[PDB]
From a paper:
Estrogen receptor alpha (ERα) is a ligand-dependent master transcriptional regulator and key driver of breast cancer pathology. Hormone binding favors LBD head-to-head homodimerization, helix 12 (H12) binding over the hormone-binding pocket, and exposure of the activating function-2 (AF-2) cleft where transcriptional coregulators bind via LXXLL motifs. SERMs and SERDs are comprised of a heterocyclic core that mimics hormone binding and a side-arm that disfavors the H12 agonist conformation. Rather, H12 packs into the AF-2 cleft via an LXXML motif to sterically preclude transcriptional coregulator binding.
Author numbering:
A (entry chain B): 307 to 461, 470 to 526, 533 to 545
B (entry chain A): 307 to 461, 464 to 529, 532 to 550
Write the structure that this text describes.
Amino acid sequence: ALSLTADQMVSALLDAEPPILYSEYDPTRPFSEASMMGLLTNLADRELVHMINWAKRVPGFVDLTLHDQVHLLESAWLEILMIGLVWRSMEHPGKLLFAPNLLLDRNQGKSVEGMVEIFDMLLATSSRFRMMNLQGEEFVCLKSIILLNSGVYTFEEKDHIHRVLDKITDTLIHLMAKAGLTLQQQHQRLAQLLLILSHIRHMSNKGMEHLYVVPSYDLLLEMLD
Amino acid sequence: ALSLTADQMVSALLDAEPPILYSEYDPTRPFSEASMMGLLTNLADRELVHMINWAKRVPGFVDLTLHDQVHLLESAWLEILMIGLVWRSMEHPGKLLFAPNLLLDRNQGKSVEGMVEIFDMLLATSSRFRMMNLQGEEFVCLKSIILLNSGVYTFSTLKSLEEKDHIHRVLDKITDTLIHLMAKAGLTLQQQHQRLAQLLLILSHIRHMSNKGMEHLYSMKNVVPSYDLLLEMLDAHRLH
Ligand SMILES: O=C(c1ccccc1)N1[C@H](c2ccc(OC[C@@H]3CCN(CCCF)C3)cc2)c2ccc(O)cc2CC12CC2
Ligand SMILES: O=C(c1ccccc1)N1[C@H](c2ccc(OC[C@@H]3CCN(CCCF)C3)cc2)c2ccc(O)cc2CC12CC2
């Protein structure tokens, strides 16, 4: 699984991308903020399926035991939803593209107490992506790093995960070298991208407090087939 | 500030290292679970004062506005406490070295509700440092990154923008320094960016523990250093 090349790594990651899901909002009925969280919960529940099937296609993931595959997914699912949302909303300044038929701004995000604080953190990350000019090849790499690194500190099983993590790091550097960046530009950009992952984790924790709901071990396992 | 060589970065960060503090000594008062949180709170408060002095000596930190210096320490003070604890406990498997005379295991962490969950995460990070053989020069770099990165996405004036641009230049200088250290230690170029990535990914877990811990301090609640308190220690005058 780790004999793939950097170019083959990106190729596998790109073709494994989940689809962009729509809201079940009846587009001819009056939209309402009281029903806003209903749409966002159903949407996220349906994105989790496609996320599971994306994870099995992350090179090296299915080499772990099913028990470990679940644990990483329990620990990373919210972070992956957020980085996906931030990615979709990247070309929509000041708004979050939850779905093509759910574009919200922070001024629709004050409907519930404790929401706009999370909203602004998501908007800030999207602005950071926009300044970074984050490439889709980098994005699928950052997303795979989240999947593998989120639950590794909460457990040969660990050593393999670290070999895949090192391999993704090789691929990120390969992209930056193929783009013409110098070596310092390469290790500076790699650093900047990984420091963003700290904010996404923080967003996840603060996100989870607001929601407190969590996908059970059995549900993630059923989805894993 | 930005002129410094990596070598000059490292000595500055090493010279700024706060001292290792102690809990109170008393041979007639045997350790009990009862006074633990009182000991730990007193130790945190005393460390916080020394943390301020270290922060002011992190190159480029006082170039920021005083208002943004506080927000960064508001955002990072707990992270810096834990990573300092993890560093002290690195050489002591299965224990957390809050002080040389306050070394605890997780059976003592079981005393307080919800504590052993964070206690076990701190030991896992200590073990992660152990199995990477984290060096002291890398340590002080990671601590400086936490100080500047943790609070930076949560500030948006024209001045706010040049603060953040300045922070990114310092963080860029630290990344250079980490690479220079790892190159100086004799790693190949692949192992350098692989180790840099391993180092920085730990910062994601340290953020995770800090949010976990912040939640736990509030479960039993004046828990956090306030803005005016942080400003007070930061906003020194020139009369000394
Ligand atoms: O609304 C919000 C939000 C809130 C405050 C500020 C900004 C955004 N969210 C959305 C959201 C809602 C409920 C939810 O709940 C957890 C699942 C629902 C039960 N699932 C378990 C089933 C158990 F019965 C898991 C998850 C995700 C959602 C949806 C899609 C997206 O791409 C991204 C997001 C982002 C965000 C994660 C922060
Ligand atoms: O016990 C714990 C702990 C808990 C659960 C699991 C494992 C460990 N901690 C210790 C701790 C306790 C209370 C505290 O409380 C907040 C300040 C005390 C009042 N301060 C505000 C008062 C001013 F208004 C701020 C801070 C720090 C402490 C001490 C020293 C250290 O180096 C590190 C730590 C780490 C840790 C932070 C997690």
